[PDB]
C-alpha cells in the first residue's frame, strides 16, 4: 500500500526525468496491501 507514484511522478515529470516519471506511475499499481 503506497499510492504516491502519482504525485511522485508529477515531480519526475517536471524535475528532470519525465521518461523516468512514467516508471513511477508503475508504482501506483502497488496494490498488494
Amino acid at each position: 500500500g503506497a499510492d504516491y507514484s502519482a504525485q511522485w511522478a508529477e515531480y519526475y515529470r517536471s524535475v528532470g526525468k519525465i521518461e523516468e516519471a512514467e516508471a513511477i506511475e508503475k508504482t501506483l499499481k502497488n496494490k498488494q496491501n
Binding site: 508529477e10 515531480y11 517536471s14 524535475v15 513511477i24
Partner: peptide, 21 residues
C-alpha cells in the same frame, strides 16, 4: 524475459515542486 540492469535510488527524497493552483 529482458533481464534488468541498474542501481537502486528511489525511497522517499524531499519533493522538488508542489504545483500552484
Amino acid at each position: 524475459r529482458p533481464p534488468p540492469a541498474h542501481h537502486n535510488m528511489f525511497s522517499v527524497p524531499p519533493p522538488p515542486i508542489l504545483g500552484r493552483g
